[PDB]
Design a protein around this nucleic acid. Structure first.
Lengths: 151, 120, 51, 127
RNA sequence: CUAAGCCGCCCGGUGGAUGGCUCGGCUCGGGGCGCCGACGAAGGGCGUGGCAAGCUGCGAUAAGCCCCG
RNA sequence: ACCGAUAGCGAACUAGUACCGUGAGGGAAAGCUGAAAAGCACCCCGGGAGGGGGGUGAAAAGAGCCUGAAACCGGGCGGCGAUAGGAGGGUGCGGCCCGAAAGGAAUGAGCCUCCCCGAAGGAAACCGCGGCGACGCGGGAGUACGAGGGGAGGGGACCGGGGUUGCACCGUCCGUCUUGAAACACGGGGCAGGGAGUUCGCGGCCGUGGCGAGGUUAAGGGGGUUAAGCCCCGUAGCCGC
RNA sequence: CGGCCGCCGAGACCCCGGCGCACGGACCGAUUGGUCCGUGAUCGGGUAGGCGGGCGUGCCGGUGGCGUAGAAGCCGGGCC
């Protein structure tokens, strides 16, 4: 995957980055992106740091089966996707670098578009009772992000 | 099953001309011959010089809405008009002193079709 | 598919006759605007042309 | 022209009132929704086959347009598909309108349009 | 400026249909040609390339050696 | 006048190969960059995979490479959205939204005003009378109105169509055996491709065409041809008399 | 319970315009076809089944064509 789903990208005012074939949960990636959308880059990085440190739960709105609630208001199911947070943090650092190279003030960068997709699946099998072999697969994730220097 | 009618464009045109001529002259002979000609091909009439000899008279006009075959003998002098003639049939008609013409020529000679006898 | 010999002969006759029909020839698409006459009969010397 | 206009209006009203005839359960499955069509219901218990009130209707011979204006362009002309200038040359400007085939390139479309406009021939897709 | 959720369009991922192509198949009247082996056959095993695993070809002279065109 | 990569031989390719069974034996999947590798020099970041610039190319067609559909998933946009019930639809219209082209239209749209004819059908005011009463009878009147059919003036850009949703009424899915299917009867997670009255021999009929007291050739032979096409003969035989 | 007076209510019945079918008639097109007129209160539901016409796909013999000024294919939309 190379293309982005953003329509009106402007190279003069915007920067973009992506990651492909990440070996993380696409569901949790979608959930984290939903929360990161619309935030400033620094705020998003601090958000991810808190999630990684387990100081801040991520709410679950779509994939939340058999998930317990968390202390405070708005919870409701939540969890701490550390691996997803780490990968997305690396992508955010990459896009920050792209903006800096283009010559955009890093303190005014707002995440205008961020999305996650399901990529290719790596197949595997696991043995089970009664001589049956059963699917045992990894689902990879694509991440895309484009930030804009607001004014 | 459907009756597709004659496949011969000449025969179809002859049928149309026959009906038109009947309307023009206010008679029924030509329309009768037309609906007899449009009979199914497995039922088209075939007549023999023997039958013509049996039921005709000298100097008479006969119309066969089909084919005329040359089995038997002819001794009368008759003018016969039919869609087709076999070689033997036509030879016998000519040798008897008559003439073997087509339906178009019969109409041209006798537009009103008075005294013409249909045979099937 | 079988074809009776006499029926095939009649079909050949009809085709040869239709060859000399002005309306059919032009209706088939052929350009006969400058042809002098249909049917076009030519002297036997045409048989010896080799080039 | 009086009867022509009356029947043209009648056809317009009829074909505005007419529905889109689609097979049963077309909306329920993507395989049918992506390829809209009408198929006669032939089931023993098919409600559409029974023609019950409250179910989609079926095509009938009574929906046909009036004979005089059947198949005509809504503008009233008779459509003729044209692929070249020679084909366009054999058209009647007073009663027929030329529709340029979708396959002819702009190069030939230029001459087709020029000939049409100098002959006073209506073109439905002049570009 | 509605949380979840449903329908429609656009973009993107997943997937490999469709269209086009074809050194491959299949079927044929006619035509050609039809045996090899104790002077060791067919079939097979193992070897053989500078980097060489499969296929193909070759046999300790081993992807080859000699002679006439 | 064969198929065109789920087709055609099982094998278009390192296919009777990989792999399965002790064995006899069984047996797949898998074609395509571009005209030319010109197959991305250099720069920033990342542990790396890669990402972003910048180059090549008519076009990334970027090797995970012709075209790139459907099902499925993520985002953006338009409509609905936490007091509301029916197989997810039908009829009619109202909100909100899209409306360049292919549909109508400035040679004039929605719309407003005025005049004429008018089928089936069809009032009332008002007046007279009958009935205990609901009410009815005669005049008004076959008048007003009426589907639709025509003409004139004003205004100047929308009507048709589409997405979603609101309301009123109606609507218990599809195929099947069955007397009877919404069925607590059977088959129905979704999408794409494949999939089921074919060939010969004999007999009965019909639609059409040739010849006709006759019809027709089979095996085969000759001419010509790139060729198996084309032309001519061939009375054995078969049926009818 | 015995009667009466109004009104509402179908695709039924009446009227207007349109389509097809059955039968008969007149015209044109060189094979099954096309146009128009007349009659229908005595034509218009439909399972098994019978008959007629038409739509669509691959290849062949002809005929007339399109295309790098952009074919097939694919997504959305307009018209018949």
């Amino acid at each position: 995957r190379f293309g982005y789903s953003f329509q009106n990208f402007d190279p003069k005012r915007m920067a973009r980055a992506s990651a492909r074939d990440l070996r993380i949960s696409p569901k949790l990636a979608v959930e984290v992106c939903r929360e990161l959308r619309g935030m400033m880059l620094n705020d998003a990085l601090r958000y991810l740091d808190d999630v990684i440190a387990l100081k801040r739960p991520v709410p679950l709105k779509r994939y939340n089966d058999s998930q317990g609630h968390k202390p405070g208001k708005g919870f409701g199911p939540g969890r701490y996707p550390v691996k997803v947070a780490k990968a997305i943090k690396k992508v955010l650092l990459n896009v920050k670098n792209n903006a800096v190279q283009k010559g955009l003030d890093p303190d005014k960068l707002k995440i205008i578009h961020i999305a996650a997709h399901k990529g290719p699946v790596l197949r595997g099998w696991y043995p089970r009772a009664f001589g049956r072999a059963t699917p045992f697969n990894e689902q990879t994730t694509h991440i895309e992000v484009v930030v804009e220097e607001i004014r | 099953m459907k009756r597709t009618g004659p496949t011969d464009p000449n025969l179809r045109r002859l049928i149309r001309y026959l009906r038109k001529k009947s309307n023009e002259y206010g008679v029924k002979i030509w329309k009768d011959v037309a609906w007899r000609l449009e009979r199914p091909r497995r039922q088209r009439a075939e007549v023999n010089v023997s039958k013509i000899n049996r039921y005709a008279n000298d100097g008479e006009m006969i119309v066969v809405p089909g084919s005329v075959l040359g089995a038997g003998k002819l001794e009368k002098k008759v003018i016969v008009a039919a869609w087709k003639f076999s070689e033997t049939a036509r030879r016998k008609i000519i040798e008897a002193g008559g003439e073997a013409i087509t339906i178009e020529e019969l109409i041209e000679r006798n537009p009103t079709g008075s005294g013409v006898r249909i045979m099937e | 598919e079988d074809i009776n010999k006499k029926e095939k002969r009649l079909a050949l006759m009809s085709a040869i006759a239709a060859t000399a029909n002005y309306d059919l020839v032009r209706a088939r698409g052929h350009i006969i605007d400058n042809v002098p006459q249909l049917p076009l009969i030519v002297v036997d010397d045409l048989q010896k042309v080799q080039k | 022209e009086k009867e022509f206009k009356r029947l043209l209006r009648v056809r317009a009203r009829l074909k505005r009132k007419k529905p889109r005839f689609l097979r049963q359960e077309w909306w329920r499955y993507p395989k049918f929704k992506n390829d809209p069509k009408w198929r006669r219901p032939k089931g023993i218990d098919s409600k559409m086959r029974l023609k019950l009130k409250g179910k989609p209707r079926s095509p009938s011979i009574g929906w046909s347009s009036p004979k005089l204006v059947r198949g005509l362009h809504p503008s009233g002309y008779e459509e003729v598909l044209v692929h070249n200038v020679k084909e366009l040359e054999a058209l009647d400007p007073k009663r027929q309108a030329a529709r340029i085939a979708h396959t002819v390139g702009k190069k030939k479309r230029i001459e087709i349009i020029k000939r049409a406009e100098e002959l006073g021939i209506k073109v439905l897709n002049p570009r």
